[PDB]
Amino acid sequence: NSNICEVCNKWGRLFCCDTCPRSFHEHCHIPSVEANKNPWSCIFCRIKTIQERCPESQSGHQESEVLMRQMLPEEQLKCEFLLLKVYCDSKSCFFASEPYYNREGSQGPQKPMWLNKVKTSLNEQMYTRVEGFVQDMRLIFHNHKEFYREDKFTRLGIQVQDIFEKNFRNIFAIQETS
Ligand SMILES: [Zn+2]
Ligand SMILES: [Zn+2]
Ligand SMILES: [Zn+2]
């Protein structure tokens, strides 16, 4: 097994996957690493199994059909993995915790949003369709772009949004286009 957390790239108290060489801090894994379960398989392994069981699940999909899917166990899992892929980027620190807004010339968003809030919402099964989760994720970056205006810090929202969108297209096998 790796000697650093796959998500935050630090050492510490690490739980090791039984079916691959990744390791995780308890609350870096999504869902939080399960109490018992020997053997234990990480989210990466669980996602790969879904693909292996149904190879056709990788054929292209329309985003509009994906968003309307109900949050059954497989879709729940895929949103957890997509959330985890965003936390994997170090720039996710800017979007993880509850923000506050006091900048000359800007007003804060009407509906603030942050990663840890999306994490809790997933854990609490508050999303009934994929659309709920994706809307909150895209709202994080949209709020950031609007608040920071022409400050160059706006670019952090572009960058982390791009990580989200690339992983959304991969995980949900969105049809490739020009
Ligand atoms: Zn970690
Ligand atoms: Zn694994
Ligand atoms: Zn199949």
- Compute, in angstroms, the gap from residue 27 CA to the centroid of ligand 1: 7
Q: What CATH number corresponds to the domain at position 23?
A: 3.30.40.10
Within this chain, do residues 83 and 29 fall inside the same structural domain, yes or no?
no
Total domains, the chain: 2
Separation CA 160–CA 138 (nearest Å): 10
Is residue 82 within 8 A of residue 145, CB to CB? The reply is no
Q: What CATH number corresponds to the domain at position 114?
A: 1.20.920.10
CA torsion sign for 59, 62, 63, 68 is negative
Is residue 148 within 8 A of residue 157, CB to CB? The reply is yes
Is residue 40 within 8 A of residue 96, CB to CB? The reply is no
Separation CA 143–CA 28 (nearest Å): 25
Within this chain, do residues 16 and 36 fall inside the same structural domain, yes or no?
yes
Domain termination residue (choose one: 59, 76, 98): 59
- Compute, in angstroms, the gap from residue 110 CA to the centroid of ligand 1: 32
Within this chain, do residues 70 and 134 fall inside the same structural domain, yes or no?
yes
Is residue 39 within 8 A of residue 20, CB to CB? The reply is no
Q: Is 63 helix (H, G, I), strand (E, B) or coil?
A: helix
Separation CA 94–CA 98 (nearest Å): 10
Q: Token pair for residue 138?
A: 């895209």
Within this chain, do residues 49 and 89 fall inside the same structural domain, yes or no?
no
**Ramachandran assignment for 53, one of left (phi > 0), alpha (psi -120 to 50 degrees), beta (any other):** alpha
- Compute, in angstroms, the gap from residue 1 CA to the centroid of ligand 2: 10
Nearest alpha carbon to residue 115 among 84, 76, 90, 146: 84
Closest listed ligand to the CA of 55: 3
Separation CA 175–CA 20 (nearest Å): 29
Degrees (nearest 5) of the Cα angle 99, 122, 14? 85
Separation CA 71–CA 17 (nearest Å): 25
Separation CA 139–CA 77 (nearest Å): 21
CA torsion sign for 52, 20, 79, 35 is positive
Within this chain, do residues 78 and 162 fall inside the same structural domain, yes or no?
yes
- Compute, in angstroms, the gap from residue 60 CA to the centroid of ligand 2: 25
CA 147 to chain centre: 22
- Compute, in angstroms, the gap from residue 10 CA to the centroid of ligand 1: 6
* 24 membership: H or E segment, kind and range: strand 23-25
- Compute, in angstroms, the gap from residue 172 CA to the centroid of ligand 2: 19
Is residue 23 within 8 A of residue 15, CB to CB? The reply is yes
- Which residue(s) pair with 25 in the sheet? 14
Q: Token pair for residue 124?
A: 């609490």
- 173-178 own/partner pairs: CB under 8 Å, 24+ apart: 173/57, 173/58, 173/59, 173/60, 173/61, 174/60, 174/61, 174/62, 174/63, 174/66, 175/60, 175/61, 175/62, 176/60
The DSSP call for residue 32 is P
Q: Can you spell out the DSSP letters for 80-112?
A: HHHHHHHHTSGGGHHHHS------TT----SS-
Within this chain, do residues 88 and 159 fall inside the same structural domain, yes or no?
yes
CA torsion sign for 19, 3, 31, 130 is negative
User: Whole domain around residue 53: which residue ranges?
Assistant: 1-59
Separation CA 30–CA 42 (nearest Å): 9
Closest listed ligand to the CA of 51: 3
- Compute, in angstroms, the gap from residue 168 CA to the centroid of ligand 3: 21
Is residue 140 within 8 A of residue 93, CB to CB? The reply is no
Quoted resolution (Å): 1.5
Within this chain, do residues 79 and 30 fall inside the same structural domain, yes or no?
no
CA torsion sign for 34, 88, 70, 142 is positive
